[PDB]
Nucleic acid binder design. Structure first.
Ligand SMILES: Nc1ccn([C@@H]2C[C@@H](O)[C@H](COP(=O)(O)OP(=O)(O)OP(=O)(O)O)O2)c(=O)n1
Ligand SMILES: [Ca+2]
Ligand SMILES: [Ca+2]
Ligand code: NA
Ligand code: NA
Length: 328
DNA sequence: CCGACGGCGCATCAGC
DNA sequence: GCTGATGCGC
DNA sequence: GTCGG
């Protein structure tokens, strides 16, 4: 990684602003800058050089000059020695504990893994499961395992109803050699933007995956989105595979292209693309792309026949999934 | 200078 | 119970 | 924290 020291520093600052300062726009600012620096194909020699990149301003340029000259940033060294910051940054690593909950636990004297394990009864369901699998959820998933997981999900969904189509998206669809979690986009002809002709379309799939012991726990579940935990079966005498996070999202069949654009990510890519759409006078969500009237009210959905159509509306050349990651 | 920053599903809570 | 805000996550 | 109007 050409500028890994810099992007690491900016990521650490982003996490501080999100988790401790609760300043979401500074978090996004740092992440935007980290991403543009990550794709820059030269080893950066100064802050002024970095300043020419969109998303890098005066303050970040100064931090880059300090980092290049000293290998460190005093602001981060300080943050690293602050007990309250350190504690909040740690607690937020548990799925379900955000900036607010982290600060509340710290105020109650709950600030270590051991404290959390003593106080399960103060956690909501999501948080309890996040704690249970804390170690497992920090492990990455090799692509070879994602392929085994894909097999299972696609075959089990087919057993429920051959009319379902499940597509694995996120970093996997972007060609990543390892993934943080699994994202499954689901469609069925009876669920469209105009009607739902069958109930329990998502439920019956979750149920099948629970029945075969693939899905092990549930963080949250509604009519269109499941967030939970899964695990590959292991063989005789073999150590068990780590538990993995899995997201399943049922999308209207006729809005698949907006859906898959959304579900493919990355997060920064989607934010950047949607911000560009706004500048071009459009709004993109997972369902539709719509024009904005001068009032700033979204108009009627535009025809979409491919992922590329969405890019054409906003006057972007098509980006293949592989070029939608944070690093190139 | 300064308003705006992507957009939304599910869980939880406050007020009626 | 519903409605709307907040937290957290994708 | 950054940037376009
Ligand atoms: N804030 C976010 C987060 C995610 N997304 C979309 C929706 C989601 O499906 C897709 C992937 O998100 P994930 O958080 O799963 O991240 P990746 O798959 O890119 O990377 P990893 O799992 O290997 O760490 O990107 C998004 O619009 N906005
Ligand atoms: Ca993922
Ligand atoms: Ca995910
Ligand atoms: Na810049
Ligand atoms: Na968290």
């Amino acid at each position: 990684t050409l500028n890994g020291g810099i992007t690491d520093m900016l990521t650490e600052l982003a996490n501080f602003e999100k988790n401790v300062s609760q300043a979401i726009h500074k978090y996004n600012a740092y992440r935007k800058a980290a991403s543009v620096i990550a794709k820059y194909p030269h080893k950066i020699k100064s802050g002024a050089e970095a300043k020419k990149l969109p998303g890098v301003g005066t303050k970040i340029a100064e931090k880059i000059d300090e980092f290049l000259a000293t290998g460190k940033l005093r602001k981060l060294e300080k943050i690293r020695q602050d007990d309250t910051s350190s504690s909040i940054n740690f607690l937020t690593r548990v799925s379900g504990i955000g900036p607010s909950a982290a600060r509340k636990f710290v105020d109650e004297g709950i600030k270590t893994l051991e404290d959390l394990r003593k106080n399960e009864d103060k956690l909501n369901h999501h948080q309890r499961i996040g704690l249970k699998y804390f170690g497992d959820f920090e492990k990455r998933i090799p692509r070879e395992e994602m392929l085994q997981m894909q097999d299972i999900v696609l075959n089990e969904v087919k057993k429920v109803d051959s009319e379902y189509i499940a597509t694995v998206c996120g970093s996997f669809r972007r060609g990543a050699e390892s993934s943080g979690d699994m994202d499954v986009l689901l469609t069925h002809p009876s669920f469209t933007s105009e009607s739902t002709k069958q109930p329990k379309l998502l439920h019956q799939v979750v149920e099948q995956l629970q029945k075969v012991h693939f899905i092990t726990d549930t963080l949250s579940k509604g009519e269109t989105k499941f967030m939970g935990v899964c695990q590959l079966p292991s063989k005789n005498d073999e150590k068990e595979y780590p538990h993995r996070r899995i997201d399943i999202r049922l999308i209207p069949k006729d809005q698949y292209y907006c859906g898959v654009l959304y579900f493919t990510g990355s997060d920064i890519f989607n934010k950047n693309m949607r911000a560009h759409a706004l500048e071009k006078g459009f709004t993109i969500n997972e369902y539709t792309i719509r024009p904005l009237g001068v009032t700033g009210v979204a108009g009627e959905p535009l025809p979409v026949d491919s992922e590329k159509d969405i890019f054409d509306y906003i006057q972007w050349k098509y980006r293949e999934p592989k070029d939608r990651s944070e690093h190139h």
